[PDB]
């Protein structure tokens, strides 16, 4: 089976001490239920316009203020989470892009969580959470148009041994590592801090791997409890 | 199953300030390589014979030590690496038992670790790891009837809510949570002090994590780090 062992560099756990994940390494199968994903969509969004969940208000702040403190501007440039979370209170919804993608933003909105999902094989070694020094190559997109862009210095990042694969933390991913629809190998990274309970990353987990193994069928997962925070 | 995080007592991890174990739970899938196990335990013993792994006797010597603190004798009553240690020595292998517990054992002696391996739905509530008062009921074997025996006061345990279920803690499993030939949903527990390093742990886990898969195609597997060594 395809591993994925991520490293999550000491400076980064100085800076976020109570960072807990849960990664998930998946071996795809066929998609014969992607109806599932439609579902768990339009359960996520009910479920937030109603103010939920609970701790959702009190783990975005805190996501808001772990990128201040790498220097970043929260009101510009948010994690995933509270970007979803923004589209789903602002729009009648979130628009669907393909199953696996409705299914792991769903998970992202009904849990107030940052849930990334990316292709392992693109990865050159093994995913690693650093502080960036400025000079890494990110591969991603300005005006529909290839980008060769940079992260700020002091700017939290996954990388690989080729460059950075998401910027800010969990605020975009690039190019190269995005997963599309035939995937055979995928990563799903869903990244909290001490105000969501350790029982609801578990609950988000667990219900994004239900979702995957009704939408396909026969799929093979690992699954690890990775971080400063998580022992 | 769908989250087993064992529990570590204050007192127990005081005792012991570098223990740090990795906890695989296991969602069993049918048996169709059994001679996998076999393969890994001859060549754990080889390994063995040969003098190694180079942690062995440090780390066994650190057990024997631990286990002294909680006032255990270790010449009469060892932790679970030791006792199979000795007896690959003495004999020059190990012979069968069934083939989970033979690959767990594999990893035990190549990797001079002890693995606990356990049938989790005979859990009672999640799994603790206490310091006994001495009046905790063990259900185990003597004379080969059933017995109701205690720990001693002071005694490193596992236990749930019922009673102990392992003594001295990796020196004998209880009856009620064994491990029978099909069972479906298992817990792994590899023990370690520091001077096992880290990485020595880390590939203990992947050996064990790939023998399953190869064993029982399609076995999902969670896994994560705990213990006050674990940072």
């Given at each position: ?32 239920q992607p109806e599932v994903a439609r579902t768990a969509l339009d359960r996520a969004c ?47 919804g979130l628009p669907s892009l393909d199953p696996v993608v409705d299914l792991?933003n769903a ?104 979702g995957?193994?009704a939408m ?16």
């Amino acid at each position: 089976m395809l591993s994925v062992l991520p490293l999550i560099d000491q400076a980064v756990a100085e800076l976020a001490p109570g960072f807990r994940a849960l990664s998930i390494v998946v071996q795809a199968a066929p998609l014969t239920q992607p109806e599932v994903a439609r579902t768990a969509l339009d359960r996520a969004c009910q479920s937030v316009l109603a103010g939920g969940p609970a701790w959702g208000e009190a783990h975005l702040q805190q996501w808001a203020d772990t990128f201040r403190q790498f220097g970043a501007k929260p009101q510009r440039t948010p994690c995933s989470a509270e970007a979803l979370r923004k589209r789903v209170l602002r729009d009648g919804g979130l628009p669907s892009l393909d199953p696996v993608v409705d299914l792991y933003n769903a998970i992202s909105i009904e849990y107030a969580i940052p849930v990334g999902g990316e292709n392992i094989e693109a990865y050159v070694g093994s995913p690693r959470l650093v502080i960036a020094d400025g000079s890494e190559p990110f591969d991603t997109m300005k005006e529909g148009a290839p980008a060769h862009e940079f992260p700020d210095a002091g700017e939290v990042v996954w990388r690989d041994d080729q460059g950075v694969t998401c910027r800010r933390w969990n605020w975009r991913q690039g190019v190269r590592t995005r997963l599309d629809a035939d995937a055979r190998h995928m990563w799903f990274i869903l990244e909290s801090l001490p105000a969501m309970p350790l029982e609801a990353l578990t609950e988000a987990g667990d219900r994004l791997i239900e979702g995957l193994q009704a939408m396909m069928p026969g799929v093979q997962i690992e699954s690890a409890l990775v971080g400063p925070g998580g022992h």
